[PDB]
Ligand binder design. Structure first.
Ligand SMILES: O=C(O)c1ccccn1
Ligand SMILES: O=C(O)c1ccccn1
Ligand SMILES: O=C(O)c1ccccn1
Ligand SMILES: O=C(O)c1ccccn1
Ligand SMILES: O=C(O)c1ccccn1
Ligand SMILES: [Zn+2]
Ligand SMILES: [Zn+2]
Ligand SMILES: [Zn+2]
Ligand SMILES: [Zn+2]
Ligand SMILES: [Zn+2]
Lengths: 298, 287, 298, 299, 298
């Protein structure tokens, strides 16, 4: 059963049990859903509606332009080198480009700014729960992530349109995320996101007004492997356009990333590096195995 | 006019003038300061902070009447980065200091190689030539000497470090930005290497004098003490590998060279015993 | 782009450009940094070393005993009524108390006296540049500031020690300065001082051997609002102790302060008052809005 | 992208700051603006307009048709880029008035023109003082700069743009920037035609009853060190409609020294320092060529 | 310092800095000289000799004829409506008229043909360097320029003979060029060509065996203003006849010109049009301001 965490149970004497659920999702799933997370359901509903309307208005034509430009009109053999995906990226931190994206509406930009700020505070709240579960001092992960200019925080807004031949192409090929903590607002009707657990692909179930959390490669390093970043993918379907609004809380470019000493006894197998060196490498090898990227930092 | 090179001026119309200043420093100064070098000022501030605080906790107590010309008024420990790091084996260094030194050392190694490629361009050598010469079998040798020069009641009796030339390739110095002391010998005068915030001091060692057939000479330098003030020094040495073959680059030689061809580790074995004696007998000894 | 004025550029016709830059900073920034100001760099280096050593020797434990008496160990909630600040004050004029600060060395007292005299001369040179830019006669501002016993001149020696939770407390809360012209020798590594400009907090960047200049409330009155006194604050940080040696060149206590008539066309909105009445009021309301203090002098 | 209209009566009251800020925005971003409630009597504007239009019909229209005949512009077979489809005469007010020397004007027109020009000269100097305040200059700075030895130069160009059968072949007045200081235009309130270039589009300066159109010339671009630029403008023709134009030019005296104001120059200016009459002698010959070479020619 | 680019440094490890110089000249100068290009120095020397000998035998007559019918033998005052210039035009593409110019020699035509082909290939190589510097796809600008019949490529062969009173008339009045990329073989002793930069006329220095490159109006549109076409002129002198062999690589007549979408964020201020409509208009208004010609294409 996929972990669903009720964050409102942290405000009372059920808080220890909630923390234990968070910790075991972090150790064994790499993913969990959160409900009662404090984000207004009214804000999620308009983010959802304006994301979908901005797709028809602005992204659908770019998407078909892409399928023509790569011959994906007609899928007669398996395509393992492209994602059946429509995306644009919004940067929040350290410097916002929200007011420079030309094709987004005023009210969409205002909703995205509010949504991004609330998710940034929720990311930092979640990192503190991780710290507590890890036996780290409060604020430890936030301070590691800061670097010189503060954390990097952006939002990937994706749609995975219907695919006539889902067997032939993935919406997004299997990978682990490079960063710190990932907070996903996904479609509540159209499924597609899957994680790999114990040798099976497991669906990340659509759930109304929920946020999906998962941990990236940097948290595997800092926890000395105690919390691993898990492989995940998006599969297409013939009917349905799955919406994806995923926010990435990453260390600053010059943050020093290393295994926390209190989590290391035997010499660590994980490297110590500067985050931007990891991200330069990751961009070119995102869909290749994760383990060579750690070795490359030594 | 001590040369200060602005590395941000390399991308542009003004790059020819920046390169000419670098070349002119290499030929006639043997030293130059670089600013806007790409190293984060917050990493330098941490390095300086932890270096000075590591002195007071670990070295200052341990550190505790006529001319003394055979001793250096100096407190030092050494960190090895390449070919193989001993950073996790220096006992008296803290985790934050060790993590900062690893990051700082990696950035200085990349900056050293960028500087070697600027030298190559000014010398008319192909890019990567000096890096390739320095590699040997195991790669270049790269380490950092962390020094403090504490106050001396009688500075005219003892030097912080006696006059010498450096044996190796290129030296990248992060020095105190308030307390002076480092001097180079130029045209028969001792010249101060001026403290400058968030700068790196570059100087060339004996190996680059050989490879350039004397076009860039390694210059004598020293550290003088002072009565008040503890000058910090974080100096990184980018050296050829032990079995690198060092010889004058053929394109810089027309008339037969006066400089020898040798293997770097034979020069270093010799250098250790005669570091404060004249440089010129060390070149002759390699023939 | 924060104004940095090179005082060596007064010696040509760059002088017009330099004067125009000073005027622009006075009108729109309220702050500017000066370089090549004539203060010996070796005297500044001594002042800094001795201030930092006097903090460690005399104030750091005194400071730590204060956070116990005021419960600032645990910053579990926001503190808006205290400054995370260690200070003492040195009065130079009209009457010196330099020989009464008990825990300072002969050599610190002798250096501070020399430093103070040089800053007093630089303050008066700067006031004459303001006079020229305003079209006032030479010495106009010095004469207004004189009163009967001469200007008031003192130095505030501050350190802002590291704060575990900088989000909770300011090093010094937002305020404008009551006085005439303020000449600040600040830490050249540790930032923290910010001014408010166009609705944003802007850092006053550390710059080695520079002096930071800002204008106080009295100059806003004399210029009939042409040069306004700008809000500024000091923020803390988690690792770094920012030093501040700030000298205040203020009118004499019984000086008559009023808008210079040549700067007044329409009847002024600013009061005419005696400086000590302004200062007696300011002491109690320093971190409250500035504008009621002008109204209270009518 | 609304054309700026400034209510000058709002300077007399609590909204003076907001009005000054609007004027400053128009000076930086449009180079043109319309003013209303400007103090010129609406009945004097009506008489000027009536007498200008009747003087065209009785005295200028025959000359205009005869001008085309002599240049063969009866037949707009192809584009004309070197002629203005324009009927004009010029009235000099300062430093020396020639009003009593124009032969074909009535005494009533001459008296109204003298009264109109005097009020416009006073309004020009009032506006220059608003610019001074917005620029941080001393009161009267621009008037003092413009004075030279004999005072400012002030004249009025009285133009009509008669109907043109083929407007796409010829402009009423080709694109240019004005050489001088501040230009105060009383234009037709029905017939449009004046356009300015803004952000790569021609923008109509909309006819507005009893308004005055203000624009800034090349000399104020120099003095403000480029903060207020002189903007390109033109007059287009139409097939029917005769647009009237009464435009007054407040210019520095001939021997006035023009340079960027010292308080606006924090680094070396790209703009020259020169004597105004040298700029004008050059401008007369290259008025419809680019502006920027004229600044370079003064160095 | 006027930009001089060594094109042989593109074949090696200095190529990035060479590209950076090209991009800098394109953004800030609109002009640059190239050395070590592909053109044999003996071909340039022969083009220069035969151009100058063709002036004396064939063009000097037409030039004095011109001065006759325009009354320009004696220059009492400024002439602002004519150029002190002797020209004939050679068309190469889409169709050559080289074998139809009656007064050109066999060997001049053969040299002119070889010269034109090498400059056409150098124009296309240079356009690809601009593409790379602009982040456009390889061949992008050549494809835009093609239309139906291919690019237009021609050569303007000019001489600017000595003028007794150079103050009175220009060799060629200030203008921007209408087309794509302009490749000039100019006199290496007699100067005269100037560009306008930062409010100053700057000489384009004569240099042995060099080619002067500048960008026309079409590249400003396609780059959305990132590379502007800059005003330039030729001044006369009393002693000296400056030679000018200028080759113009322009889009085909029916090419669609518009800002490249990857260079546009906010709505472009530049029009989208068909090139021949721009050229029809330009011919009549060449020496009037540039900006109204862009406005006219909307
Ligand atoms: O696009 C991704 O890589 C993604 C999106 C949401 C959650 C995890 N990963
Ligand atoms: O210790 C040395 O020999 C040294 C240190 C820094 C720079 C140059 N030389
Ligand atoms: O303590 C203050 O109020 C202060 C200090 C330095 C500069 C400005 N203001
Ligand atoms: O005739 C002109 O040049 C003019 C007329 C009115 C307004 C601006 N310019
Ligand atoms: O004749 C021209 O317009 C020209 C000639 C060469 C270079 C630029 N422009
Ligand atoms: Zn992912
Ligand atoms: Zn050394
Ligand atoms: Zn203050
Ligand atoms: Zn005009
Ligand atoms: Zn041209």
């Amino acid at each position: 059963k996929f972990p669903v965490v009720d964050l409102s149970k942290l405000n009372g004497e059920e808080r220890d049990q909630t923390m234990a659920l968070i910790n075991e999702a972090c150790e064994n799933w790499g993913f969990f859903e959160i409900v009662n997370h404090g984000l207004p359901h009214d804000l999620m509903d308009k983010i959802e509606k304006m994301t979908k309307d901005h797709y028809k208005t602005c992204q659908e034509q770019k998407f078909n332009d892409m399928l023509k430009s790569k011959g994906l009109d007609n899928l007669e053999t398996e395509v393992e080198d492209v994602d059946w995906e429509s995306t644009f990226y919004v940067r929040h931190l350290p410097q916002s480009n929200l007011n420079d994206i030309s094709d987004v509406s005023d009210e969409y930009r205002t909703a995205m700014k509010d949504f991004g700020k609330r998710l940034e505070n929720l990311a930092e709240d979640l990192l503190d729960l991780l710290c507590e579960n890890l036996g780290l001092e409060k604020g430890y992960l936030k301070k590691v992530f800061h670097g010189t200019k503060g954390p990097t925080f952006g939002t990937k807004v994706s749609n995975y349109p219907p695919c006539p031949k889902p067997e032939m192409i993935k919406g997004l090929r299997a990978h682990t995320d490079a960063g710190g903590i990932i907070l996903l607002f996904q479609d509540d009707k159209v499924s597609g996101l899957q994680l790999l657990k114990d040798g099976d692909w497991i669906d990340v179930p659509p759930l109304n007004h929920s946020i999906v959390i998962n941990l990236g490669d940097q948290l595997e390093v800092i926890t000395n492997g105690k919390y691993k970043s898990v492989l995940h993918r998006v599969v297409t379907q013939q009917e349905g356009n799955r919406m994806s609004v995923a926010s990435f809380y990453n260390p600053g470019s010059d943050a020093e990333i290393s295994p926390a000493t209190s989590l290391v006894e035997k010499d660590s197998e994980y490297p110590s590096f500067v985050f931007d060196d990891y991200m330069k490498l990751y961009a070119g090898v995102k869909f290749q195995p994760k383990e060579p990227r750690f070795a490359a930092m030594k």
